[PDB]
Amino acid sequence: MKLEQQIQRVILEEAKALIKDYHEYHNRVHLESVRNKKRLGDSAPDKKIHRPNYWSFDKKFDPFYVKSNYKSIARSIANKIENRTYLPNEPFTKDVPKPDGGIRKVSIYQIPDAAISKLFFNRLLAKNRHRFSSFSYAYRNDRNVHFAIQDISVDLKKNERTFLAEFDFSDFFGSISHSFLNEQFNENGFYISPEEKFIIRSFLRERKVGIPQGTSISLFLANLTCWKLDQDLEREGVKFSRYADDTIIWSQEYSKICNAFNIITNFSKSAGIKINPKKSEGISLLTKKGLPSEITSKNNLDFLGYTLSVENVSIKEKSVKKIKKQISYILYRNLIQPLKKTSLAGQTIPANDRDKNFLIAICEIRRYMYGGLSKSQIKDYLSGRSNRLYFKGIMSFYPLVNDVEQLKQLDGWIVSVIYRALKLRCQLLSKWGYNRSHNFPFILDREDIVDKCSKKTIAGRKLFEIPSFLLIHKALQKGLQESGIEKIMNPQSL
Amino acid sequence: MKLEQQIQRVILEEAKALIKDYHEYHNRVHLESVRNKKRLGDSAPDKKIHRPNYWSFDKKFDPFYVKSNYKSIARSIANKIENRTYLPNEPFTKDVPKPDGGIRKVSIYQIPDAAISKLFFNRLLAKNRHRFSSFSYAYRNDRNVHFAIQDISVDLKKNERTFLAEFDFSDFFGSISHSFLNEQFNENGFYISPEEKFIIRSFLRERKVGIPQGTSISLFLANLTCWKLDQDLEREGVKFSRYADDTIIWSQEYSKICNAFNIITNFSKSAGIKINPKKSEGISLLTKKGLPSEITSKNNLDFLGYTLSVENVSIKEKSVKKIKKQISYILYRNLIQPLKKTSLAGQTIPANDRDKNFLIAICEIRRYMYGGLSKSQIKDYLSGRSNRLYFKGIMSFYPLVNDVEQLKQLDGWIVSVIYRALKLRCQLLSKWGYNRSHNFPFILDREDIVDKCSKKTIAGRKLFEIPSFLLIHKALQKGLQESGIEKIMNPQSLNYDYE
Amino acid sequence: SQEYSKICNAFNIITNFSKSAGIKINPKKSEGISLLTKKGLPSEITSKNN
RNA sequence: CAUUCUCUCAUAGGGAUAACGGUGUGGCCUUCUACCUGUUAUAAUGGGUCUUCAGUUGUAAUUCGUUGCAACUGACGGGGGGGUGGUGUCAAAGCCGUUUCAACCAAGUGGUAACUUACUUUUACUUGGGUUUAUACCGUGGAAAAGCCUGGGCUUUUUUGUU
RNA sequence: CAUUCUCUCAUAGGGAUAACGGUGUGGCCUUCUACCUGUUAUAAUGGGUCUUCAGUUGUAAUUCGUUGCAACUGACGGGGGGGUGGUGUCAAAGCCGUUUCAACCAAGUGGUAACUUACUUUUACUUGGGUUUAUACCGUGGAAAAGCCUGGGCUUUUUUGUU
Ligand SMILES: [Mg+2]
Ligand SMILES: [Mg+2]
Ligand SMILES: [Mg+2]
Ligand SMILES: [Mg+2]
């Protein structure tokens, strides 16, 4: 029947994708092993290839085995579904402690049961698509969440005094009674077929307690339980956005947020589970940066990888610290770490004004921020000479940053860190007996570093220019006004 | 370059689409002419191949000329857009009298400017798609408008009292100052590129007064002008749905709908123009048989061909009358009209229980009703033998009807009309001198019209069974519950054999 | 005003009128809403006395 | 003025060619597809029957939300006018049955018929997707007659190709 | 147990084969991309420069909605500690300059340091988009050698097909 062929197709595609990912993993490991041997010399460790541990718990977790017997698995699953005796096997569940102090139970289903939950719940979320609230996402890394960060950003700016009330539904989704879920299958004009209903009931029967967390099932079953609360909150006028389990609620009027708080409390009582505000306090006013206190009178809302304010959008502090970590660690790897090893055997020592290690460091920093773009390409796109510009970098995950001062400070930080790292590298090289304090890398003095690096050219193409966040931010602002958030985020779309 | 290539592609696609339609038009006119010659006999009128009138007002309206110079037209248009000296040519405007007081100015642009508008304003409405209200459509026949009718139906079925108010934005879109549009460009986080602003300003300069009523440009500008009204109405808690130059607003509380009236008044004042509610609507309360809250209380609302009540969704009376007219005219044309002519020259007369005209009439009715689906296919889809049943018919335009009584009445009407038409055809045949009363079509007796027709088979296929609305409605209910309104109303998707 | 929900709607009415005229109206210095309560109880606001 | 090709002074113009683009039927291929029965070595062909929903009961499970199977039961083709029998009774209702009239609008209008390349805000769609014989269409180009003019042009028909 | 093929009772099992799937580099096609200048008769190839935003002025259109062109002005690479000078003031804060220290966290900690197959909800991505010489990886297979066992089987390395 068509069902078996559809299963076969989905299972095969999933297995092939995982196999391709593993092959890329091992090839990348080998290439990095070659580079590390050429970098640390004869002190580099050996090449270690690791298979994911859960590939061993059950033979179905292995993509290779699934590709071996995809036909048989599809036939058996189709027969069991049409006999209504299907149950998804136990998912491999790992408990990752949440930073706030909680724990998130991440469940990974087997490839067969992960393919069936991506075929029957990606259709159920299309036919019943218009019956869900506008801002309701599944994982905090989804590409459509950035449409919500825009809305808040557009409101925080316009209504200069916005009341916010962030919430946490983790305990709610974790332990919602299955009967309440099963009572919503025929309301709000949901189109759920008899087969899809059976599959939903099988997946919920496996859990016995509540909705799964990190699965395609999560989004639909979350939009199937909080469909009355959503409608109530819309009817009060307060806007909202649920990322995975958090639920921010914002509106201009105090009364509306006060009523939304009561609506959420009543919904929590109705479901029989407790919903608690994530913020220690309840309502919180996010006013302009300059103003006294009243309820909270805060000026920075976090959301994800952002810090929204009435003035502008900016990168969250933790994300900025991680960017600093990665850049400083790239410099430390390519400049300082090899020299700290007990023996300099098989390491290229800079000489003749050429420092291949410095070139590698700058190139890797560029790939991490720009993605490989040279400044000439970015300027060409900005002027109009170029029709296309590909965005793939750490700045491609923040295509809404309006804060120019933060990028300026971060660029200055990059320059200063490069200068200090080069100074320490020169000191260590001298301590090892190889005195190089008059060459190109070490002649620059923190005010000519950018200029001298820019002038320097390799193979006819500038390969030393110090990367700058501000230029790519200008490019992103231009791109968003020509392609939109969607295209900038997902360049593959054509 | 790129702009030139894109313009070339879009213009050529538009021209080829229009040419394909014209080729099919005269190929369709010829087939119907042949059938007419075999229906009206030797008195049949001669064939006529018309050519759309607006293809002569300007050469650039002609699909057969715009394909000749698509390269040159794209070259010049690109050069003029890069030189900021591009003004779209005058569109052809026709005034269609609205059924109520008023006129609709339908504008048909030239193929080049239509291509440019369909290219630039489809991207502008995609990048800024999340900044527009949920229910906002361009045409009353739009296939995505059923997503709003389902919402109103669900609200009516669930709520206890639903207050509704309908508005008219026809004057709003005909007298809105363009300075307002220009002022509404950089707010609400709209991503309008510099050249996409130039083209908007050029298209608005061409009009000088207001938004073109019908075109790809219409919807984006309608959503761009009425972006504060949508935000305010959303903030109050009253839902809305615009579709074409109209606005329904429904809410559970009278105070909220009154505040919606006040918000529309303020917005109309700000724009400098008037938004008048339809003069026979006020606020309609579709209560659940409860207290009327001292407001005009009705039980049926009319919305884009549907009659929405608190218990069922049915076909509007006007649409039912149109369906009845079409079926009755099919029967009259295929059974009665050929006989009323002054001479029966070269017309096939019933013989040996065979009535080719009756078979043609029943098959045409089946195509209009179902789309050619035989009852066996529909029952196979219902049982489960098959998984595909294309919905191509009049009932494909009403995939939300829950009313079973209306469909039963319509089926009985079809049966009665078929019986009466066959009786009149027999009378006329006798008057002409041919007594076919004994023949098969003229002995059915009405009660056995549906019974004896189903048993009869032609070419080993049941081609006489009288089509029924109820069976296809059952099939549509199952198809909806298994595929969604989008797929039922949009029967191409990717393709068949999609596994 | 006697209700916080009402004075909060006064900042929103001056914020919209300020944008309608196209000029800014800022709260004097950094005073903010001041609750001159009779010591009955506080309501999530800076309770002053003078 | 090829709707073909080509060139350029490129939303316009010039040059070259007679073909360019589509339609119905049939065939082929790929689609999933209950049950019976004719003609044959198991294939084609012909014919025939079924497919739905609601409720109850029984029955095996269930995470008590619900599901599976069986047995049935019920539903599953409008309205109007003129007659007309029965049934109803403060008396009338009311109900049911029977007969007759119609193309629909018309369960209507002061009054009624016509119409589909039509009519109407939008009243919008057509056989499940690709190939391959015969039929044939729009506008073109030729060829032969036919009537207007001139003494080549214009005009009609047919034919040819497109095929 | 090839991640290859194939069969079946089919989410498990059976049989057969040595090959299956990927990576970096270059090449071949695509892809629009300014200006000058080396290098051989307009081609290749070496080198160099420029591209941004805001505001003002002039000027052109002008739908008064704006736009175009030209000129000019301004912005266009962090923070901290120690030392030091100038400027401020009733003294000071304050401002400007200069020198030195620190790989980042660190604008910190009691205290520093280390780490990228790492860390962490969600830390995510790697050069628009297609082919194919030489290099080479995942798990397989086969040989040789080398250790164990037996008296071939097992283990290790190299090599080979893969390629
Ligand atoms: Mg909704
Ligand atoms: Mg919105
Ligand atoms: Mg009548
Ligand atoms: Mg430090």
B252 with A235: CB under 8 angstroms? Answer: yes
Nearest CA in chain A to B148: A130
* Of residues A154, A235, A482, nearest to B237 (C-beta): A235
In degrees and rounded to multiples of 5, residue A291 shows phi and psi of 180, 150
How big is the A-C interface in CB pairs under 8 Å?
37
In degrees and rounded to multiples of 5, residue A293 shows phi and psi of -95, 155
Tokens of residue A199, six digits: 């599959």
Q: Which residue shows structure tokens 């079409």?
A: B326
Residue B280 Cβ under 7 A from any strand D atom: no
Residue A360 Cβ under 7 A from any strand E atom: no
Instruction: Tell me the resolution in Å.
Output: 3.5
Distance from C-alpha of B470 to C-alpha of B405, rounded to nearest angstrom: 9
Tokens of residue B54, six digits: 């607006």
Q: What angle do CA B122, B126, B130 make, to 5 degrees?
A: 145
Distance from C-alpha of B314 to C-alpha of A278, rounded to nearest angstrom: 47
CB atoms within 10 A of CB B248: 21
CA dihedral A308, A314, A318, A319 (to 10 degrees): 130
Q: Measured between CB atoms, does A261 come within 8 Å of chain C?
A: no
Question: Structure solved using which method?
Answer: cryo-EM
A305 with A396: CB under 8 angstroms? Answer: no
Q: Which among A291, A62, A36, A274 is positioned nearest to A168, based on CA atoms?
A: A274
Q: Which stretches of A432-468 are DSSP H helices? A: 440-443, 449-455
A254/C27 CB distance under 8 A: no
CB atoms within 10 A of CB A175: 14
Chain gaps in chain A, named by the residue before each (C–N > 2.5 Å) = none
Tokens of residue B362, six digits: 């029943």
3-class DSSP assignment, residue B85: coil
Can you spell out the DSSP letters for A373-441? --HHHHHHHHHTS-S-----SGGGG-TT---HHHHHHHHHHHHHHHHHHHHHHHHHHHHTT---SSSHH
Q: How many CA atoms lie within 13 A of B109 on its CB side?
A: 23
Ramachandran area for residue B372 (φ above 0: left; ψ -120 to 50: alpha; else beta): left
Tokens of residue B85, six digits: 């000296």
Residue A307, strand partner residues: A314
Distance from C-alpha of A162 to C-alpha of A157, rounded to nearest angstrom: 9
- Strand D, nucleotides covered by protein (CB < 7 Å): 1-8, 10-13, 21-24, 30-34, 46-53, 63-68, 76-79, 102-107, 114-118, 120-129, 136-139
Tokens of residue B314, six digits: 């049915």
B398 with B305: CB under 8 angstroms? Answer: yes
Please give the DSSP secondary-structure letter assigned to residue A462: -
Q: How far is CA A67 from CA A50, A73, A137, A284, B337, in A?
A: 20, 10, 31, 53, 67
Residue B333 Cβ under 7 A from any strand D atom: yes
Tokens of residue A434, six digits: 């190889």
Amino acid A103 reads I
A168 with A246: CB under 8 angstroms? Answer: yes
Amino acid B475 reads A
- Chains with 3 or more CB pairs closer than 8 angstroms to A? B, C
Contacts of A112 (CB under 8 A, 6+ apart): A11, A60, A66, A73, A77, A89
B121 with B190: CB under 8 angstroms? Answer: no
Q: Which stretches of B334-391 are DSSP H helices? A: 337-340, 356-369, 375-383
Q: Measured between CB atoms, does A482 come within 8 Å of chain B?
A: yes
| A151–chain C nearest CA distance, Å | 19
Residue A387 Cβ under 7 A from any strand E atom: yes
Ligand nearest to C-alpha B328: 3
Tokens of residue B183, six digits: 């002022």
Q: How far is CA C19 from CA A44, A95, B180, C15, C22, in A?
A: 64, 51, 15, 6, 5
Burial class (CB in 10 A: 0-12, 13-18, 19+), A408: middle
Measured CA to C1', what is the nucleotide nearest A413? E78
Tokens of residue A321, six digits: 């610290």
Contacts of A465 (CB under 8 A, 6+ apart): A362, A374, A375, A450, A453, A454
Contacts of B281 (CB under 8 A, 6+ apart): B164, B165, B166
Q: Measured between CB atoms, does B280 come within 8 Å of chain A?
A: no
Ramachandran area for residue A94 (φ above 0: left; ψ -120 to 50: alpha; else beta): beta
Measured CA to C1', what is the nucleotide nearest A23? E22
